[PDB]
Design an enzyme around this catalytic site. Structure first.
Site, PDB file in Angstrom:
ATOM      1  N   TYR A 136      36.771  25.750  74.597  1.00 50.95           N
ATOM      2  CA  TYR A 136      36.198  24.420  74.360  1.00 50.95           C
ATOM      3  C   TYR A 136      35.994  24.009  72.646  1.00 50.95           C
ATOM      4  O   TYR A 136      35.557  25.051  72.128  1.00 50.95           O
ATOM      5  CB  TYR A 136      34.885  24.101  75.112  1.00 50.95           C
ATOM      6  CG  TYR A 136      34.397  22.797  74.851  1.00 50.95           C
ATOM      7  CD1 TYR A 136      33.239  22.678  73.981  1.00 50.95           C
ATOM      8  CD2 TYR A 136      34.367  21.725  75.542  1.00 50.95           C
ATOM      9  CE1 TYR A 136      32.412  21.713  73.634  1.00 50.95           C
ATOM     10  CE2 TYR A 136      33.445  20.391  75.299  1.00 50.95           C
ATOM     11  CZ  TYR A 136      32.551  20.632  74.463  1.00 50.95           C
ATOM     12  OH  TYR A 136      31.878  19.302  74.328  1.00 50.95           O
ATOM     13  N   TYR A 182      39.998  21.451  75.874  1.00 49.79           N
ATOM     14  CA  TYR A 182      39.428  22.243  76.685  1.00 49.79           C
ATOM     15  C   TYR A 182      40.704  23.017  77.147  1.00 49.79           C
ATOM     16  O   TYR A 182      41.743  22.577  77.371  1.00 49.79           O
ATOM     17  CB  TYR A 182      39.157  21.750  77.953  1.00 49.79           C
ATOM     18  CG  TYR A 182      38.028  21.012  78.189  1.00 49.79           C
ATOM     19  CD1 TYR A 182      37.729  19.487  78.119  1.00 49.79           C
ATOM     20  CD2 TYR A 182      36.894  21.704  78.742  1.00 49.79           C
ATOM     21  CE1 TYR A 182      36.648  18.855  78.392  1.00 49.79           C
ATOM     22  CE2 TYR A 182      35.618  21.113  79.013  1.00 49.79           C
ATOM     23  CZ  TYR A 182      35.370  19.750  78.861  1.00 49.79           C
ATOM     24  OH  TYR A 182      34.110  19.021  78.820  1.00 49.79           O
ATOM     25  N   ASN A 220      25.066  17.340  83.551  1.00 54.55           N
ATOM     26  CA  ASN A 220      26.034  17.838  82.775  1.00 54.55           C
ATOM     27  C   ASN A 220      25.452  18.844  81.754  1.00 54.55           C
ATOM     28  O   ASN A 220      24.495  18.561  81.163  1.00 54.55           O
ATOM     29  CB  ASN A 220      26.995  16.952  82.208  1.00 54.55           C
ATOM     30  CG  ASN A 220      28.364  17.514  81.502  1.00 54.55           C
ATOM     31  OD1 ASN A 220      28.593  16.664  80.486  1.00 54.55           O
ATOM     32  ND2 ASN A 220      29.011  18.357  81.944  1.00 54.55           N
TER      33      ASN A 220
HETATM   34  C1  LIG Z   1      32.510  17.016  76.968  1.00 53.01           C
HETATM   35  O1  LIG Z   1      31.413  17.870  76.809  1.00 53.01           O
HETATM   36  C2  LIG Z   1      30.073  17.407  76.854  1.00 53.01           C
HETATM   37  C3  LIG Z   1      30.089  16.251  76.057  1.00 53.01           C
HETATM   38  O2  LIG Z   1      29.889  16.879  74.730  1.00 53.01           O
HETATM   39  C4  LIG Z   1      28.831  16.861  74.046  1.00 53.01           C
HETATM   40  O3  LIG Z   1      28.362  15.964  73.538  1.00 53.01           O
HETATM   41  C5  LIG Z   1      27.189  16.017  72.713  1.00 53.01           C
HETATM   42  C6  LIG Z   1      27.085  17.071  71.597  1.00 53.01           C
HETATM   43  O4  LIG Z   1      25.878  17.086  70.979  1.00 53.01           O
HETATM   44  C7  LIG Z   1      27.447  18.474  72.412  1.00 53.01           C
HETATM   45  O5  LIG Z   1      27.581  19.261  71.374  1.00 53.01           O
HETATM   46  C8  LIG Z   1      29.011  18.268  73.075  1.00 53.01           C
HETATM   47  O6  LIG Z   1      29.268  19.462  73.612  1.00 53.01           O
HETATM   48  C9  LIG Z   1      31.083  15.092  75.952  1.00 53.01           C
HETATM   49  O7  LIG Z   1      30.605  13.621  76.266  1.00 53.01           O
HETATM   50  C10 LIG Z   1      32.166  15.504  76.961  1.00 53.01           C
HETATM   51  F1  LIG Z   1      33.259  14.666  76.799  1.00 53.01           F
END
Ligand SMILES: *[C@H]1OC[C@@H](O[C@@H]2OC[C@@H](O)[C@H](O)[C@H]2O)[C@H](O)[C@H]1F
Length: 207
Positions: free
Chosen positions: A85, A96, A45
């Site tokens: 987002y 989102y 991801n």
């Molecule tokens: C949606 O986006 C990815 C994730 O979000 C991240 O979580 C860690 C934080 O440091 C980042 O800034 C975020 O973008 C999340 O699990 C998912 F639901």
């Protein structure tokens, strides 16, 4: 200005962030204003974004009207989203507003309603993340979505209209943590050139 690993900062007035879990690679180039380019390869991801991070004291109404004018050359090879987002806190919610995607239209759930705005029609959804990464550590939180019925990669997203629709449907929002034009990839590779990205709050561009 070259970001190839988790990083948070401010670049040319925009709060930028590069976030990925383990595996694969990503490269984000921070360009002028809200612009940036992104490239990813074999990730689990990955998210790239430039917007505004807030101090967690105001509702979206208190921040004011949020509107994003953007343009992006979006070239996913598989699963990816082009969207606005962000997050709220108390409650912790990730959200989102999806204008384009790759091979899969998110988020795989039954719609809760629809919103017509910005010349499009979006299906509204609510999903749940269980013990996953978050801005506040490993957490269980809701994800709120508006997903356009047809793809587009440039235009204006009246963010606050989406928030009111969500609240109308009972999708509770907390205090603002962030709003940002974002590219997300999942178990894929690709690239995106965000050549236009201006966030206006109460009609006034970020600086
Ligand atoms: C949606 O986006 C990815 C994730 O979000 C991240 O979580 C860690 C934080 O440091 C980042 O800034 C975020 O973008 C999340 O699990 C998912 F639901």
């Amino acid at each position: 200005q070259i970001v190839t690993d988790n990083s948070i900062g401010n670049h040319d007035g925009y709060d930028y962030e590069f976030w990925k879990d383990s595996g694969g690679s990503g490269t984000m180039i921070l360009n002028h204003g809200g612009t940036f380019s992104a490239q990813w390869n074999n990730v689990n991801n990955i998210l790239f974004r430039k917007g505004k991070k807030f101090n967690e004291t105001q509702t979206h109404q208190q921040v004011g009207n949020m509107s994003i004018n953007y343009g992006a050359n979006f070239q996913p090879n598989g699963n990816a989203y082009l969207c606005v987002y962000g997050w709220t806190v108390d409650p912790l919610v990730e959200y989102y507003i999806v204008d384009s995607w790759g091979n899969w239209r998110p988020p795989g759930a039954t719609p809760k309603g629809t919103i017509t705005v910005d010349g499009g029609t979006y299906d509204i959804y609510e999903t749940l993340r269980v013990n996953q990464p978050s801005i506040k550590g490993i957490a269980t939180f809701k994800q709120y979505w508006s997903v356009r019925r047809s793809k587009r990669t440039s235009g204006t997203i009246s963010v606050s209209n989406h928030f009111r629709a969500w609240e109308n449907l009972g999708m509770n929002m907390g205090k603002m943590y962030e709003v940002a034009l974002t590219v997300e990839g999942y178990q894929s590779s690709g690239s995106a050139n965000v050549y236009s990205n201006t966030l206006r709050i109460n009609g006034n561009p970020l600086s």
